[PDB]
């Protein structure tokens, strides 16, 4: 309840009051025993861990109003993708070059063909794949065919921060808010707003400026908040990809300097994307012309934007509430207790 001032945001609390999708309790539960099931985290690691690390609250905090079955996927999606990170985590500071290659192909083919994939022994290409099947059958192909092309695109950024990390290289300023768009998804959670309200918007609708830049800025708030609030345990853990991170390598500034840039960066995108938000707004009652699939399109373009804006609200209490963060609380500040 209560935010360390150097990451705390007036505005958010505020002007961005959380929501809580009514599904959340049994979200929890069911991706904790898909963890379980899927052998995505050893039984012992789930049972200490897995509720206090809140993945599902996360996801429960941002796509409001999608069915039950497919914020359940969502959910699973959403902790597979933290396990993923912890799995390029680990292959990285144990320089299982070979590993991680082979991982990456796997998941490139497990994503065109995620049933060929469903039982395959690596349990981490398995869980991928059933997770990605559950998403594929809720909108016609020409979503699951982005989506695809998308996260291929996610794939190839965590290679290069492979490359990266192995190499000690520290992007540059620039050339890292490029990779972040990838290395976060922006544009995965983006898609999956669309199977949240029902709707596979047409390009015209999803390209549509204000569309386009308050989906945008949804997801840097998101990146950039997780850079502020993620700096510790990076730091501690020889993570090189962080926004504060290239600004004190390459525009040689303190840390309490990055953190104040980050911070301001973070504190921008709010209220740009009140400005655009009303564009969006606009936008979303000019489709309803009249006709019955006007009003389905406007419907779910407003359902849309307003998770872009529960996005803000459940990512900052998310890096005040979960496990994930409190390095501090760790025998190993290098390890957290977690991963495996
Ligand atoms: N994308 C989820 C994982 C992260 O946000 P996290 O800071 O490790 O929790 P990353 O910074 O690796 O992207
Ligand atoms: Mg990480
Ligand atoms: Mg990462
Ligand atoms: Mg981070």
Redesign the pocket.
């Known amino acids: 309840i209560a935010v360390p001032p150097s990451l705390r945001l007036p505005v958010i609390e505020a002007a961005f009051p959380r929501q809580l999708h009514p599904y959340w309790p049994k979200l929890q539960e069911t991706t904790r025993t898909w963890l379980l099931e899927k052998r995505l985290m050893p039984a012992d690691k789930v049972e200490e861990y897995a509720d206090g690390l809140c993945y599902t609250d996360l996801m429960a905090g941002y796509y409001l109003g999608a069915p039950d079955e497919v914020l359940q996927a969502i959910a699973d999606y959403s902790a597979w993708?933290?396990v993923w990170?912890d799995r390029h985590d680990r292959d990285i500071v144990h320089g299982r070059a070979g590993a991680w290659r082979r991982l990456r192909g796997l998941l490139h083919t497990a994503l065109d063909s995620p049933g060929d994939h469903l039982h395959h022994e690596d349990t981490l290409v398995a869980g991928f794949a059933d997770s990605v099947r559950r998403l594929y059958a809720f909108l016609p192909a020409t979503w699951n065919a982005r989506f695809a092309r998308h996260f291929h695109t996610v794939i190839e950024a965590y290679d290069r921060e492979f490359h990266n990390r192995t190499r000690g290289i520290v992007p540059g300023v620039e050339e890292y808010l490029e990779l972040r768009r990838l290395?976060?998804?922006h544009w995965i959670w983006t898609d999956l707003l669309e199977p949240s309200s029902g709707c596979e918007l047409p390009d015209a609708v999803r390209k549509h400026p204000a569309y386009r830049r308050a989906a945008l800025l949804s997801q840097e708030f998101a990146?950039w908040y997780?850079?502020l609030c993620?700096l510790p345990?990076?730091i501690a853990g020889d993570e090189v990809?962080?926004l504060g991170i290239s600004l004190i390598t390459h525009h040689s500034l303190t840390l309490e300097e990055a953190i104040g840039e980050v911070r301001r960066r973070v504190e921008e995108c709010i209220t740009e994307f009140l400005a655009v938000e009303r564009d969006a707004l606009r936008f979303a009652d000019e489709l309803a012309d009249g006709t019955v699939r006007g009003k389905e399109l406007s419907g779910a373009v407003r359902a849309n934007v307003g998770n872009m804006r529960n996005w803000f609200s459940s990512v900052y209490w998310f890096h005040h509430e979960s496990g994930?963060?409190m390095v501090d609380s760790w025998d190993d500040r290098s390890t957290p207790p977690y991963v495996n």
């Open positions: 993708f933290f990170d290395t976060f998804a990146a997780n850079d993620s345990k990076e990809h962080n994930r963060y």
